[PDB]
């Protein structure tokens with residue numbers, strides 16, 4: 159694909175990927191690059207940095223305020239009042255001012271902008287966070303946190319109960335709890351009333367309370383999370399903690415009857431002798447249609463249609479893609495069409511894995527389901543490719559250096575035979591070092607380096623009252639934390655479907 163042919167395709171991650179491939183091979187001229195940002199679907203990350211090596215962006219200063227950016231710290235007392243207040247939006251700018259000018263500006267703004275006054279006078283002290291905390295200036299607190307994560311102080315009951323109302327609270331709490339940073343802030347958040355938090359925030363504050371062995375407070379946070387979470391899977395995670403902490407058999411019963419298939423509902427079913435959930439069986443009689451499963455642009459087009467289809471148009475697409483060749487697209491349509499109530503666990507292109515042992519089959523299928531939903535031309539925002547979502551660098555390492563496949567190109571990752579073969583190859587490497595399918599999943603998504611560093615820690619996946627569940631909540635990268643739980647659920651299901659059942663309690667025992 160030349161740039162001229164790509165420019166005729168609709169904007170998509172597939173088009174972005176192929177533009178990025180031209181940039182990385184130096185095939186986009188300064189002239190070609192002129193109109194190109196209107197041809198880019200998601201102008202973020204590597205494609206933006208490559209394009210900008212060809213054409214810098216000067217942009218962008220609102221023309222109304224351009225004059226404001228002609229002043230510096232040395233000349234800002236010469237600027238009009240609007241210019242002064244625009245430049246004081248930046249804490250680095252405030253930090254750069256001399257203290258006499260901070261005093262002058264704080265007086266200027268005391269009436270109309272006491273927020274600015276508070277920050278100016280804060281930066282005249284040796285600890286601006288202490289000054290902002292004494293004022294109980296909530297917007298000021300978050301500005302200072304965004305400026306520097308190194309500030310740490312005890313916060314009283316009144317102040318900590320005010321923080322949840324700010325949009326920044328959820329990321330603040332998640333970051334400091336998961337990274338085990340800012341211990342005075344962490345300890346302070348034990349005094350947050352569960353009435354003042356909900357959803358993710360409540361849940362994280364439950365995890366926080368567990369780490370300080372405040373189990374009654376933890377229960378109260380998790381109960382609030384369960385009552386407020388929008389997604390049944392998250393509610394189930396919260397109910398599981400309620401159960402682990404207080405052992406009310408009604409909580410375990412509710413969890414065992416969940417409509418969501420996740421590790422918590424599966425565990426609860428096992429503990430209560432409840433039958434394994436019903437898994438749909440898709441067996442289209444029609445063998446093919448016209449659709450090209452190897453065309454990445456055709457997938458981008460049909461995906462967009464499927465995601466914008468009303469209740470009625472989903473039924474039309476379901477029928478058209480109800481074939482063996484388009485089974486992954488069929489299951490994808492059904493999963494949306496049935497409002498995520500039915501469990502679809504397909505095994506496409508099965509001839510490529512049927513000679514592996516069943517435990518290995520299940521792990522491959524579990525990874526593919528979460529990575530791609532088995533869509534052969536799946537492309538991620540980071541341009542991971544195909545059913546097993548290989549990053550180009552690893553794909554080329556395996557395909558060119560290790561396997562020495564003649565005329566190998568990274569786009570071979572769109573072929574199911576190649577995806578499953580490479581997937582098996584990398585999963586062999588990972589499993590030989592890590593053993594547990596949960597740890598393998600963490601390493602598949604996050605890398606073996608991150609996984610090894612986590613497992614080297616004294617506080618992760620060791621013995622303990624709430625282990626290994628607590629450790630699973632504290633995996634320090636959110637994408638990997640979530641991924642491991644999903645892949646582990648899938649693994650249990652596929653082992654069951656292949657007549658190679660394992661108890662999820664055995665998996666959990668082997669994590670410690």
Ligand SMILES: CC(=O)N[C@H]1[C@H](OCCc2ccc3occc3c2)O[C@H](CO)[C@@H](O)[C@@H]1O
Nearest residue numbers: 528529530531533536537538539542547641
């Ligand atoms: C295609 C894609 O973006 N896949 C994602 C995947 O996205 C969720 C599943 C998925 C599958 C097929 C899809 O086709 C269009 C969007 C999409 C998302 O998330 C994983 C992390 O949990 C990533 O490792 C993986 O690269």
